[PDB]
Amino acid sequence: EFQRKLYKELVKNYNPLERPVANDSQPLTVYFSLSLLQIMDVDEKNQVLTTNIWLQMSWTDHYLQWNVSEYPGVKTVRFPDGQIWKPDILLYNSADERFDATFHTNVLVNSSGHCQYLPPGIFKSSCYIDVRWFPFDVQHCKLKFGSWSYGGWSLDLQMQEADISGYIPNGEWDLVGIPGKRSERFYECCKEPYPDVTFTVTMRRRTLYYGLNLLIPCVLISALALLVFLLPADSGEKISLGITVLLSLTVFMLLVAEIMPATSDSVPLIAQYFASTMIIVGLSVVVTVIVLQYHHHDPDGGKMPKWTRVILLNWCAWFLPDLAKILEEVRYIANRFRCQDESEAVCSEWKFAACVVDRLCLMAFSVFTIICTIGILMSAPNFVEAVSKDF
Amino acid sequence: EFQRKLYKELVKNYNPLERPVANDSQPLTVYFSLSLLQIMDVDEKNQVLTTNIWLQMSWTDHYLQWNVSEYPGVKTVRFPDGQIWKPDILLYNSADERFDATFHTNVLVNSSGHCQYLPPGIFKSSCYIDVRWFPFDVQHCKLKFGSWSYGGWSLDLQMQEADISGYIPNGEWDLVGIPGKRSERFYECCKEPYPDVTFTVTMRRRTLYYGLNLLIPCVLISALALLVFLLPADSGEKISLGITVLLSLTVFMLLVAEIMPATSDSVPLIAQYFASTMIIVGLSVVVTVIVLQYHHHDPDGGKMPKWTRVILLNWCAWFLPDLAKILEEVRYIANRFRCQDESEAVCSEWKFAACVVDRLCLMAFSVFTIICTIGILMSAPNFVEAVSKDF
Amino acid sequence: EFQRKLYKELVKNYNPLERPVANDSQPLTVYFSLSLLQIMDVDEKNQVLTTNIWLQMSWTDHYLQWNVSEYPGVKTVRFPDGQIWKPDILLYNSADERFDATFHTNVLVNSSGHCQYLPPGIFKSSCYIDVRWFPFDVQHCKLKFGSWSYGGWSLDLQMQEADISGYIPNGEWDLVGIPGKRSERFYECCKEPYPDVTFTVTMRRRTLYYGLNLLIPCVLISALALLVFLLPADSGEKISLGITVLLSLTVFMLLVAEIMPATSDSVPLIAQYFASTMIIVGLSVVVTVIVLQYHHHDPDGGKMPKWTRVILLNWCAWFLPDLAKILEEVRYIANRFRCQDESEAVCSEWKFAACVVDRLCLMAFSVFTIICTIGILMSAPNFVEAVSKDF
Amino acid sequence: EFQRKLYKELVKNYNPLERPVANDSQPLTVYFSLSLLQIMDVDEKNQVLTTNIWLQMSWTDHYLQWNVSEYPGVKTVRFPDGQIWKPDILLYNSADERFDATFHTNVLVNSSGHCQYLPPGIFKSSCYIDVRWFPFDVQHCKLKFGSWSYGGWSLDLQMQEADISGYIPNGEWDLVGIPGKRSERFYECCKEPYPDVTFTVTMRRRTLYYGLNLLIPCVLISALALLVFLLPADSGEKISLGITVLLSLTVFMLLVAEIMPATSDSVPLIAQYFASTMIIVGLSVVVTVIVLQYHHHDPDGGKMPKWTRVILLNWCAWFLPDLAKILEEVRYIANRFRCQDESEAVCSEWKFAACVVDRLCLMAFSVFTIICTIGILMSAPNFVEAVSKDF
Amino acid sequence: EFQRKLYKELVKNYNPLERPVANDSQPLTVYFSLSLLQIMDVDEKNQVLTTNIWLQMSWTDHYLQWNVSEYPGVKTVRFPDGQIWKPDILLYNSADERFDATFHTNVLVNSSGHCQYLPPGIFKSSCYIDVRWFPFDVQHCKLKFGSWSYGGWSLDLQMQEADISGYIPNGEWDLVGIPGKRSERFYECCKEPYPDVTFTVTMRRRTLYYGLNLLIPCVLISALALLVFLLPADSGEKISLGITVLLSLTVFMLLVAEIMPATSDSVPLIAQYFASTMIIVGLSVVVTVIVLQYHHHDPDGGKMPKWTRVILLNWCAWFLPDLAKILEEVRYIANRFRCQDESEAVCSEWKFAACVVDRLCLMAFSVFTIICTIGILMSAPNFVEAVSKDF
Numbered sequence A, B, C, D, E: 001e002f003q004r005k006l007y008k009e010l011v012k013n014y015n016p017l018e019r020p021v022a023n024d025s026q027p028l029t030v031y032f033s034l035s036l037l038q039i040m041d042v043d044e045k046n047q048v049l050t051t052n053i054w055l056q057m058s059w060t061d062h063y064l065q066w067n068v069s070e071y072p073g074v075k076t077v078r079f080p081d082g083q084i085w086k087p088d089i090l091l092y093n094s095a096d097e098r099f100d101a102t103f104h105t106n107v108l109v110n111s112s113g114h115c116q117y118l119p120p121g122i123f124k125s126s127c128y129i130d131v132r133w134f135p136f137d138v139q140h141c142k143l144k145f146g147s148w149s150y151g152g153w154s155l156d157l158q159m160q161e162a163d164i165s166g167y168i169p170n171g172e173w174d175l176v177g178i179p180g181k182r183s184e185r186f187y188e189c190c191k192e193p194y195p196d197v198t199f200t201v202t203m204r205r206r207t208l209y210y211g212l213n214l215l216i217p218c219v220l221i222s223a224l225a226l227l228v229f230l231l232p233a234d235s236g237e238k239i240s241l242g243i244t245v246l247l248s249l250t251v252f253m254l255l256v257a258e259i260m261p262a263t264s265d266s267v268p269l270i271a272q273y274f275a276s277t278m279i280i281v282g283l284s285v286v287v288t289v290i291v292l293q294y295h296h297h298d299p300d301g302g303k304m305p306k307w308t309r310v311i312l313l314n315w316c317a318w319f320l321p322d323l324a325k326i327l328e329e330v331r332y333i334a335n336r337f338r339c340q341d342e343s344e345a346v347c348s349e350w351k352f353a354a355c356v357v358d359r360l361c362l363m364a365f366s367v368f369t370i371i372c373t374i375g376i377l378m379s380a381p382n383f384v385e386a387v388s389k390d391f
């Protein structure tokens, strides 16, 4: 009975289009804050960040002042979108295709004339994502808020501390904080200045999934490709293994390339690792070809180099009537056998050379693989941190 | 003729913006309920739940009271969205990009002044999905409803029992119930408190599809990889089989990783199983390399260890003129043959050692595989339940 | 000149919110029909049906009655959405995220007061799809229409026969008919009853695509895997073939699982077929291992079982001075040769055993494959029908 | 100053809901045309066509007539959507989920009372796509326009020639023309007739991409699978090659099936080609098995057929004291050698038979492949055309 | 207090529908500019460009002129969408499905009557993308702006220089500039002319990602396929390697075809490279078949060509009582041995021929591969530029 009379009274001569103030040349103060319920999702490929937040706008209005004595028991009044005045605050860097995801909600007012506006939102923003240290990476995403048609001479934004109290953990990221900052900028459009409020979300990725799904299989594959050397040449399965491994590695590179963005600013870590692995395996294939070349060789058809063989041997050693016709034919067959034996002995020497080559290159490749893996993974700053918590 | 007159009369001096009550300081009561037609879908990857429900809001209005004697035969009247007052009840935890999926429908009123509002909706909600026990998993999804600009001093929500009578079975989940709960919370925004109504859907996954599509092939693949040992070394297909199996297993891991979320909170069961399988197969490859190492070996080039061979043998046994020239040459060839025979015998000893190694490691790996499979699958609490119904 | 005057006259004292009738307590009659232009699409995975239809609502209005003599030459008048009264008829079981796809169009009226409303629509509906007999399957999809805030005491729905005259063939389904049915239900919300109109679309899938793309390759793959037996053990390609076939079959199972829903209500046919095929091929691999076990075997190292060999043989047969030194050495070498020959003969016996095993298991597996394929495909009721038309 | 007065004057007593005419019983004439800027896209799978066009509606209005002498210098006036009357012309066969993609724009008027309305649009339409001759295919897509609530007695549509002057080439299709046609139809809804305007777009696909990406690899794969015959049986790589080729072909069939619709109306060309290729390769595998069967064969274990061998040979030929003990033992070993030689000779005969089988079946399969490829590709009507322009 | 009075005064007799000018026949001037914040994304497949920009419209209005002395301290006033007049400027070539992505914002005015309108937007445009030189490619995308219902006689567009000051680098493209141009066109719709403003964005792709992900593996694969020749025929892994490589190359072609559009206008570079690689590898397979044909060959079964062998040899050379019975049998066995030796020697000659063929074709294919790679990659104009910056 009093609420109705008050509602009649307030909009007697109102006009939403005016900035409500006692002095027309004195700027108005608006307190702007953010509240962050959830980190909905992150997309590296498209470079977008989806978040669920509540804005918080507060400002005092002169006209909507009423006395509590004449109107009893009524403390708070509400007004919808178009009936009163609201600041047209919205996101500068959006990717929503509608550009304003705010669900227009009510406005609360109390006798002094204060006014609150907490519009929720599922906001999409255009971060700049970097993968120089993927998966051991930390990301900085800035949300930039400000007014559009109102400037410093006519509006004045002041920042309050954000709110992470209701924050719900995501399960794929860790939140340090969302520090805020105010600035005044000078756009090449207009005379008067324009302020802005920037909140810088810091996130750290939890690496258990990407550590138990990518890295461990990669190291195991490298181990398997190292294990090829020991397989003796007699078994014909010496090179099918390596080629199958390379095909598997190619599949793996497809997988990882799908889940990463195409940024040419800086080369990523995981790409360095994959490149090293493929080069190592290719050199393994080449060495294996050399080995099978030495192993199969006709002693009578060819000969042997000197310097190579002697150096190889040194390195290995340090590391490790009618009766007359009868006689004639028997002599012949025995000589045949002796020649065969000598040929076989030379072949055996060839084979020993092949085995020593195998062993030497095996040790070399094991050392190279171990060193490269360790160095590449140590290169990441956050590694020491990420392994202490996630594991 | 009377309907028209009533409609004229009721909106003579109405204003939608007022909370309709006899006493302005006395709070209003609103009865809120839910009805659940269908569980539209669930998405583990994005962690979202899509449901089809009918809200149920009921409250009494003082102004829309009319006498039935003067207006005859008219019992119920209807009012659209903006003409009368409605509570702005909406979902707190939404993922719709429009944030309010409710299809604004009519409002029904009867002479006492009671009012009903049943707006339907395809609601999306941000559950927290867990896969610690996938596929034998049970999920708890909470839907949180409440008002936005109205508090306890001005509105009072009371909960009625939900409705699963019209529920349509999904074919991929089982519904236990949707218990509801009321609470009062204190947000770091405002002085007065705010209530909320939370419904906790419990779902259990039916495992026939995921049991006949994933687990059975995995066990069969492990069996095939066990069957490699028995393949004798003479056939060159001893290691191509295992490597092909590993490539297939990698493909399988791709498949499963696509259909699972990237949560680092806790390691999942199926990942434990896959890790065990890949480690087992890798050790199988290594053992096979060792076997082919022993089998192919030059007796004259090398020798044999003692402790290893004797222990191996024990374990196996418990488990299982010119005429003179003629004579000279004949003597020579016979001695050659005897030496060849001795070499062959030593080679045979090597081969027997290889076979016994094969058998021993085969039994060891069979035991390990069986034990690990059984233990990993027993680890799931719900297993005993899920196998009784689904199968 | 007369149209304008009529339009002025009709809305002189109108109000869209009243149910237009002579008697306020007498219910109104509404004739509701459907017309079906196209079956836009079907999605098994999400269980949705997308259709293009035209509603048909007809009802008489008392107020919009005018005399044709005073207003000459004007027969039909039109009214847009909010100016007159329309029944809020909409789909009960929708999946559109907007929940009302109807494109609000005009309303036609003629002097007696009759009114037509044909709003088009691309409607999405939540069918219950079943794949127990895929691809030889028939589907029943129900569209449920009714009013929301109007009941029997205040509205009365009557059904007319649907319209398939304009129906456009799809190319992937066949339409039998869309029988309609009326019912009155009692929802656990309200006192008065509520009617509903349900149209049951029946569809049959045309199988040429899925018969020439899935089944034929499957049978050919089974044939190829049968052809492995005949490959003699000497060629080392006896088991690579089968394993490659199994990998291909796994790929095929991936393909089919992608295009099918995850319903645990009932096991599907195609899954039965695939399971049978994989089990058959696995037993083939095992048999091949056994064969290569017998073929490669040292006669001197081991011996032979009796019962197995004799039974195998029976089944096959039914189915199919210095001179003294010279003499000594010659004697020795000849004895050596004789022993070698005997060993070779025993080896030949082993090999013959392997070949007979091959043949027997080949026939067994051919019989099993043929019988299972024929039985599984006959199991489908619609098969006899689907092969008469589609092929 | 005059524009304002004119705008006041015109809407003094207007009502958008009336059909504007001098005579109420005389029908109105509307000139309807289309203009086609771009062929946005085509989707075979869903059977949809996305286009960018400008409608062109023209009609004369009686009320908006003004004298140019009293109002000077003002020639054209503009009116937005709801202020004046417009015909509710829209697409009959749409797939947009909003059903009317027209961007409501202004309306232009000139003193005589003529009125223009050119609303742009990105229209989606439900073509009927056919792939009987893919990729050498020509497509007919019909766009059907007409009014909804206005008939012949009240509206009269007349068609003007379309406009392809601004047409922008797509790069994946070629446009012949868009002939238009008018018709009057009799829907089973209503008494009065209803006209319609149908434009029939004709498109021809440019085949360079699909000719250099699909066909050429297919023919090369068939060539490689032909090249298997020449590989001699001694090299164990005779059947791995063919099976790998078959796996590749399966992958290719997956690729092509993804990019084609599931229409069972008629079998497509590319499917015929793939079926022929797979059957050819399967018979190749079978022949290879036969060859390896003959090549490996124990002469003593078995014998040889007569008719087959003789016919094969003909076709090939047309196409292409103590001393006594010493003597005894020597006799024995020599007889042994002679028997071995005879066995080897019989084996050689077997091998020659295998080689001749290889050659004969090779020529047969080459002839079959060439003939089938040529015939299948000639079968397409448009082939001769498509190869003259695209290449 | 003055703002309110001014707002009352200005809209006393306003009408948004009039073009505001002193003279009704004199055209109005509008200054149009663009500002470019970000290049959101590019899609080659669908041929679309997504950008984030700010329009800039400026024009003077006669009615909204007020004196600053009477109204003190108020300099700028604001007006929302429908209250005042705005030019309906929008994109001609759009792909948004809503066709106008502009977020309608306020309008700023100052006493002289000047008016600004800066509506932001995430605009989608239909470029024409070309891949003739992918990845070393430069793209020209034109954005075409203009008015719809207003012409030269009634509106006059003038262009200001664009703004790239706030431009944010993308990380996948480089921006040269966005030159603008004005034109007057004559559409086949209307009498009066219509202007337009076209901005031509130039972009250059940064190639590090596509250079380290595609090209390097391709060259390594070609190297591996070259390395097959050196593998001696004795090892049975001579052709499995090449076929596995071809399968990998097919997978790679799938990958690249997915990420490229299906434009038949002109053949692309990367396709030329892939075609060359596959042809080279196929000829490699054929050569390998020839080699294995010569290597395995029965000397007694056949003979040798003359011209081929002699030319091959020249090119290689330039490049690089009872006792009588005893005697009889001994004679026999010795003759047997001699014949065997001669056969073996002829076989050795065959094998040497095979090896020389291997070497010659190896050098030929290495030369061909090197030349083709170098020539194909040099063919790109931008290559020399792109390698200087990106690397």
Ligand SMILES: *[C@@H]1O[C@H](CO)[C@@H](O[C@@H]2O[C@H](CO)[C@@H](O)[C@H](O)[C@H]2NC(C)=O)[C@H](O)[C@H]1NC(C)=O
Pocket: A110, A111, A112, A113, A114
């Ligand atoms: C109306 O709302 C304002 C906004 O909070 C209230 O003003 C606050 O009052 C408390 C009480 O001492 C102060 O601590 C705060 O500093 C005040 N706000 C600000 C921004 O300074 C006010 O009390 C409310 N009630 C009335 C009747 O005005």
Ligand SMILES: *[C@@H]1O[C@H](CO)[C@@H](O[C@@H]2O[C@H](CO)[C@@H](O)[C@H](O)[C@H]2NC(C)=O)[C@H](O)[C@H]1NC(C)=O
Pocket: D110, D111, D112, D113, D114
């Ligand atoms: C108003 O618009 C109409 C529509 O075009 C104009 O009428 C055309 O005038 C030309 C000039 O001779 C004729 O060739 C056309 O045939 C006319 N249109 C039609 C549909 O017949 C008219 O000139 C314009 N101006 C005025 C003042 O009416």
Ligand SMILES: *[C@@H]1O[C@H](CO)[C@@H](O[C@@H]2O[C@H](CO)[C@@H](O)[C@H](O)[C@H]2NC(C)=O)[C@H](O)[C@H]1NC(C)=O
Pocket: E110, E111, E112, E113, E114
């Ligand atoms: C209102 O806005 C106009 C638009 O800029 C202002 O006019 C500009 O004034 C400066 C000052 O000398 C000139 O350099 C510009 O050339 C003017 N604009 C144009 C388009 O020529 C004007 O000063 C503003 N204030 C008032 C009171 O009119």
Ligand SMILES: [Ca+2]
Pocket: A042, A043, A044
């Ligand atoms: Ca992510």
Ligand SMILES: [Ca+2]
Pocket: B042, B043, B044
């Ligand atoms: Ca699921």
Ligand SMILES: [Ca+2]
Pocket: C042, C043, C044
């Ligand atoms: Ca389907």
Ligand SMILES: [Ca+2]
Pocket: D042, D043, D044
């Ligand atoms: Ca296409």
Ligand SMILES: [Ca+2]
Pocket: E042, E043, E044
């Ligand atoms: Ca791109």
